[PDB]
């Protein structure tokens, strides 16, 4: 889909992890709970630091998110559409993880970011990447976490195909 | 350093 | 060759630069003219910082050195045996760059380090990575620079295949 | 893990060396290239001989191996799970060295010893001592050496989590 800066432009380290079978029946909104980014050259560096945390500290195969969102109106590829993520035990092989870079427990993402996210989700089902009757959900609905924050959680609660 | 061949 | 920690181990960024044709005719010794490292986990980090400076600040395709040396007695892969470096105008496509992490103008590198460099070069020609009549030269002989330091230069002047 | 005779039992010398951080991403199979032992009282003595060689002769802080294997079917603690060894420059702070007391370039170790080594590794992963996706490797893969012998290298090449 349009508007996504690929793994080669931001300098992702190379890996080889379990493949994902489409279409995915679930959609998962997550937040990093860390610092955020506003200019391009700055976000590419933020995406670099996160993948390295997942590989070096958590001992995971790769960044645990399918896609990420920068406060710069752009979308950055994590593991992509064709690889499973690792943030929700038991839903990983049938879901797509989308997380905004930053801490949005009290403050939500800017307009340009939320727009970037919805356009991505709509482009997903229009192309069969997401089942025709998929289920959008909050990270907290199927995991031992507070993510993706109350503020951002109430926003997506109104979006299409949410479960509840 | 120091590109150009 | 053994005693070499790969790009995946110290976490290198992904690139796709002009490849190099073997064997190489020149062998150039360089020093970074910066800070050094003595413990493993500490060196892995110094190599990440240097690659990033070349890509981000210098606008080069990748780290401009084929191999690097830490004072922990281990060798670290830059661009490798199969990719050209970018430090000597007119010699890059026909040479192999080996630099020592640190500033050795007045003080030379420890024993552990010096041994690793010679061990590496010896493995290179033994496997055809360097022409049987390759030429060893200081960076100062073929570039507008003082590198790799007078103290380091004087020591390598006695090494084999040196040009002078 | 059961089946391990401790330092106090074989009478080790006192030391105070750098600690290791668990889990360890690598597992290294090594051999001493020295004499072997078949009866307990004899192995306890060989272990004392090895420690003193590293300390008195090589000027090392302690025995350079985490654990050792005897042909009496028992396992002997070198520096342990919580201390770094010194046998692979650049991989020491992230690996667990396991070496069989003896020389196995042509003849591999008896069934008793091999069974205790595999049991130890399995007990290591289960208790989180080794990352669930650790990498098994021979000393020759990451160092300037022929250890742990061709005979032993072939056997371990079929063992799980091997890299290659």
Swiss-Prot record, chains A, C, D:
N-acetylmuramoyl-L-alanine amidase domain boundaries: 26-149
Sugar-bearing residue positions: 38
One of the GO BP terms on file: killing of cells of another organism
Record keywords, A-Z: Antibiotic, Antimicrobial, Disulfide bond, Glycoprotein, Immunity, Innate immunity, Repeat, Secreted, Signal
Repeat recorded as keyword: yes
A GO-annotated cellular component: protein-containing complex
Tissues/organs with expression: Detected in skin epidermis, eccrine sweat glands and ducts, mucous cells in the submandibular salivary gland, mucous cells in the throat, ciliary body epithelial cells of the eye, small intestine, colon, stomach and in mature epithelial cells of the tongue (at protein level). High expression in skin and esophagus. Expressed also to a much lesser extent in the tonsils and thymus.
Lineage: superkingdom: Eukaryota
Similarity section: Belongs to the N-acetylmuramoyl-L-alanine amidase 2 family.
Function comment: Pattern receptor that binds to murein peptidoglycans (PGN) of Gram-positive bacteria. Has bactericidal activity towards Gram-positive bacteria. May kill Gram-positive bacteria by interfering with peptidoglycan biosynthesis. Also binds to Gram-negative bacteria, and has bacteriostatic activity towards Gram-negative bacteria. Plays a role in innate immunity.
Subunit structure: Homodimer; disulfide-linked. Heterodimer with PGLYRP3; disulfide-linked.
Name assigned to this protein: Peptidoglycan recognition protein 4
Organism of origin: Homo sapiens (Human)
High-level lineage: Eukaryota, Metazoa, Chordata, Craniata, Vertebrata
Chain's gene name: PGLYRP4
């Amino acid at each position: 889909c349009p508007g996504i800066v690929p793994r080669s432009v931001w300098g992702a380290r190379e890996t080889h992890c379990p493949r994902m079978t489409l279409p995915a029946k679930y959609g998962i909104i997550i937040h990093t709970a860390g610092r955020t980014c506003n200019i391009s050259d700055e976000c590419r560096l933020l995406v670099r630091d996160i993948q390295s945390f997942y590989i070096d500290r958590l001992k995971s195969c790769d960044i645990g998110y399918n896609f990420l969102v920068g406060q710069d109106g752009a979308i950055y590829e994590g593991v992509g559409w064709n690889v499973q993520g690792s943030s929700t035990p038991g839903y990983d092989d049938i879901a797509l993880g989308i997380t905004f870079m930053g801490t949005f427990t009290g403050i939500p993402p800017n307009a340009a970011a939320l727009e970037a996210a919805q356009d991505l989700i709509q482009c997903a089902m229009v192309k069969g990447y997401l089942t025709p009757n998929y289920l959008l959900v909050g990270h907290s609905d199927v995991a031992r976490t507070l993510s993706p924050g109350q503020a951002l959680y109430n926003i997506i609660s109104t979006w299409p195909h949410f479960k509840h | 350093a120091x590109k150009x061949x």
